[PDB]
Point group: D2
Chain length 334, copies 4
């Protein structure tokens, strides 16, 4: 036990959030809303992930539900959340994956079955948006639902504080070379919405859009017009890195940026960031037990004004860990 | 023009049937039935294949349909063949990619949609089953609907006729080191029927089921119990190889066995079999313009009655080429 | 500490054997013979492997050598082992990777610098050959050097005992779909010796030779003429599986083979084998903390006489763990 | 026949120079200098490329050399150009793949081997450096030896001329999401110079260094400080894309910028640049028959003086094509 959660979308994102909430936070029991994965599937699926290792403990199928390490967890069939329950297990704060659901209307929708406060894994046009890094006093009890900015978007945000607070930034752009997602396809094919030209996998270096800015601004207003993005998603299954290029107000040294985040990561942020003088460590990370991580070295080049800077990801997980990070910030706090 | 065709499932298997029907045969004029793949997609989609290259000549859409090298082709979305026109064009010979649509029951359905005869890109429970390799007088007018053995099942039938009739064969088992399917997934996940793990993609060498057994049986009655098999799906997008092991009646010498197919390959078969003393060409094939292709060398080792032998695929395509080769022969008779 | 080892070829195979000897056995201190990896490189390299995770502990660069978890380890430059020392550290029993070195002449050669008994990672034409599985009383003090059959070859051997001891086997062949090796190349290229047509990586399903038999017979004489092989190495970096097909003396049931190894793995072997009724678990393993592992289910089909059977690998590691397995069998025993 | 050529490093870069020199130019007759790649390999090796397809026409070896479409070609092994003949054939224009052989010092050496002028497939410390894009009157007889900018460095030079001269540009940084190299490794390992991790292949999105800076500088003096960059090597075998970010003098509109290259691309450049409104074609290119190719759409976003822009590669080949295009122009003058 701990807090008091339920989850929507036993899948990738769901599993760590189910996975983590338990071992990192723990924070209380729960329940599982998973139409299209059954009693049993949850045992395997959750437990065995090719990208992070297997589970451990004992994830088993006992009475009406699953016993993840004994702490009695349930599976809820329904497709259409209002539809399911959630009231049973008393699952006051729930997180959702899914795809579709995102927006006050819908996430806001859950509560009919039970819910209280809902945290979502992904942005939304419509609705309160956060992250670990900047969130501060922003989260207000007054608030009923909350989102955790995207992979991209949450890891960007940490760099922002340290760097725009200390050296200016005026006009900055980025790209992220990313790990494959749910949505990237085998062989060839149709797609859908933003195309994401769904014509790869294994085979091509796939250029793509993201709202690095939107997101990054919402989180640090200041920034919030002075930033935008795109990405090329490559075949890597787990982990990704972010490239930031900047033009800045106060003069920098490369030596300088590096130690700003070094001293600054040292104290407030701790949880998201890093600073690995370390030396090209490629892609390791993959649930390193960090959120956004930057390093010195990488593709840095300096000059007064313009500079180039790279931070990183470990999407999937890092991510799922700043969600539970915030599930306790919002539960304590409201 | 040529025969007179229509097609189910503009996709992977679809594009070639269309692609080749045209280049290889032409077999006239046609039409396209594809819910989810709209007017324009068909131009890009068909045109562009990560796997085989891109198309060429031109693939544009003018009035109401697409112009395939001018050959006025059409697009019908229709979700459920019954529902789709089909007399429209006057295409008595349509071929079903699809997935689900197996069996006389539904294949026959289209017929009421419009249709006449239909070839199916994939095996079937109940219903006539053929392949070019073995096909022979088998095919006769009584016939209105038909199928061309599986990717893999069409490939083994060839090796067999040349092997069984010339050498004996008592008990033979198989494995197919296969290329990726439609059904193979990125990350890890739910799945379905026959299971298949929906558990990998780029990471695992996936264990799997196949029906070479029943399949080759039909195709060549005699065989038809003296066989069964399984396969392992690997990251490999296009092309796969087949492993057959046998125990034969009349003794062989690997020199002799490889011999058989050579002199035999030259004569009745040609468009099916191969024979490359050449020297383990890894996996090029991939639109080689071959059905199944064997070679001497490979993983060949001998002893009077025991021997292992190995063939190949060029699946996707090779297949795509025998449909047409089947469409060809089919029309002819009737 | 523990036994008293040194190692030749800090690389893949070397690292687990350096890695394992320490955490599994521990068995004493050591020293490292690595021309073409320096003081420092050993810290990273060893510690960080993309295929198994990172190290832990603290692998650091202190006085004249490396301190792996404090237990004082050294690095020895020289290329030509007679050439190096080995006498320093008193490294009585050493294991070698390398490539080249294999044969009594050469491995036998070491001793000039120091050495006593040498264990090698890989077969040899010339010389005592073992494995964990069959080795028994065979290892005789009388013996100065010993080898641990190949990836392939060591995992085969476990299946052999259980299955030929209990049900006959007369005429049996196999293939193994394997993980990439050191020797498999990026893009295109020359090669060398057995070609292994060194024209792939990522890109093709590469057919190959192995001496499944030779090896398997040396280990269980009996077998030793009645078995041979080939393999197709695929893009998977870590782990591989073995396919065995058999014709047998006593009648089997599939149900039966399975429980023979089940009860038999239960008691003597324990260390190598498994029997996972478990259900397609693809490729997980990857240092599962097992050597050869078989399962029921997989690609099994039955009939009296002929049968098909699949066991597995986790090369790299499993392997490196039956080496230390035997380093203690040969040290205790001689 | 055509010009009159010879070549260093039958490999990757080698085969195309030879491949294309023939198809594209021909530029006559020739000879091959390749220690490790014997008489016959050259037939298979050249002929067969995993990456581009296979060759065609015919690639056989008759008397003393190889018959390239009949065009009597030769094979010289020679380890050290000095050592290799070269007047033999009478090939005053030889082109160096190689690796190490950079610089006037050695390139000049061959000359004593036999030679006259030599083009080098790769940058160089000291020595004339060119590329087609910018090349112009730059090239003049004084010249005996020359180089064609890097895979990546040849690709940016084009974007620049069209961008710098038409729009301003103050400060610009870059990243290249690159395809795999010769130097990229399978498993993990030693490595070398510039480091590069020799740490991955199929598993990691590798951080890396490049000299677009110096490189594009030379090629277009003006630029030549207002640039520098780094790249990330990914599993992707052939083709890569380039990311350039700039701050310009005269304001742009993304509509306007993309505009420039269009009207400009049509006219002076043609064989270098591109312009595909077309729509993120992921990575097909791969022997598209293009040098560097840009497009509108991609990861394009605008603001008066700040803008990010993106080009492409077709490295391997595209390159292979400008050598010849360079060999072409080179011979001409002299
Ligand atoms: N996956 C990544 O790499 C990454 C990184 C950061 C953020 N994200 C975000 O996290 C979200 C979760 O996606 P994922 O990749 O973890 O999922 P996934 O595809 O692996 O599994 C999601 C499953 O949940 C089910 N789902 C949700 N509610 C359902 C209902 N009632 N009926 C039917 N289906 C329902 C599924 O749709 C789906 O099969 C994404 O939409 C995105 O917003 C992804
Ligand atoms: N790697 C696998 O997948 C697998 C599985 C089972 C068995 N094996 C066996 O294990 C052996 C070890 O190869 P690996 O893949 O672990 O190595 P690796 O390529 O990763 O590293 C080996 C390094 O050791 C050095 N080496 C050995 N002695 C040296 C000396 N004095 N001078 C120069 N170089 C020397 C290297 O040559 C080489 O760079 C193989 O040859 C094979 O017999 C491999
Ligand atoms: N994929 C391979 O590598 C491979 C190789 C050889 C043979 N095959 C064979 O090809 C068949 C499938 O072709 P594919 O793999 O290219 O599939 P695909 O996904 O590329 O195309 C088929 C798709 O078309 C659509 N469809 C068409 N008409 C429809 C309608 N009226 N109603 C509903 N859905 C409709 C669906 O999206 C369906 O999934 C397999 O069953 C098998 O027999 C596959
Ligand atoms: N590999 C890519 O994807 C790529 C793309 C674009 C440009 N490049 C350029 O191509 C160059 C290298 O060509 P490659 O990548 O095809 O290499 P490669 O390995 O395929 O071929 C070069 C090899 O030829 C041999 N060689 C030739 N003559 C020799 C002699 N006399 N003495 C000693 N060794 C000799 C060596 O084995 C050498 O490593 C790079 O330096 C770079 O400038 C590479």
């Amino acid at each position: 036990g701990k807090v008091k959660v339920g989850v929507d979308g036993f899948g990738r994102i769901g599993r760590l959030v189910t996975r983590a909430a338990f071992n990192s936070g723990k924070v209380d029991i729960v329940a599982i809303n998973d139409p299209f994965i059954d009693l049993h599937y949850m045992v395997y699926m959750f437990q065995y992930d090719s990208t992070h290792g297997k589970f451990h403990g004992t994830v088993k199928a006992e009475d009406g539900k699953l016993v993840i390490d004994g702490k009695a967890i349930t599976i809820f069939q329904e497709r259409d959340p209002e539809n399911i329950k959630w009231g049973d297990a008393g699952t006051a704060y729930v997180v959702e994956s899914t795809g579709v659901f995102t927006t006050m209307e819908k996430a806001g929708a859950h509560l009919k079955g039970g819910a209280k406060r809902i945290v979502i894994s992904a942005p939304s046009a419509d609705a309160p948006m956060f992250v670990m890094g900047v969130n501060h006093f922003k989260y207000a009890n007054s608030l009923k639902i909350i989102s955790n900015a995207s992979c991209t978007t949450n890891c960007l945000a940490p760099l922002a504080k340290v760097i725009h607070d200390h050296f200016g930034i005026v006009e900055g752009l980025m790209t992220t070379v990313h790990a494959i997602t749910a949505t990237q396809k085998t062989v060839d094919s149709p797609s859908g919405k933003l195309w994401r030209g769904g014509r790869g996998a294994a085979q091509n270096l796939i250029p793509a859009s993201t709202g690095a800015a939107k997101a990054v601004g919402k989180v640090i207003p200041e920034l919030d017009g002075k930033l935008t993005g795109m990405a090329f998603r490559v075949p890597t299954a787990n982990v990704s890195v972010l490239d930031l290029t900047c033009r800045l107000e106060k003069p920098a040294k490369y030596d300088d940026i590096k130690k700003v985040v070094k001293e600054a990561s040292e104290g407030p942020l701790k949880g998201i960031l890093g600073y690995t003088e370390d030396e090209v460590v490629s892609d390791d990370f993959n649930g390193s037990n960090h959120s956004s991580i930057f390093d010195a070295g990488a593709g840095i080049e300096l000059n007064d004004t313009f500079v180039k800077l790279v931070s990183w990801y470990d999407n999937e997980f890092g991510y799922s860990e700043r969600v539970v990070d915030l599930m306790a910030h919002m539960a304590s706090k409201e």
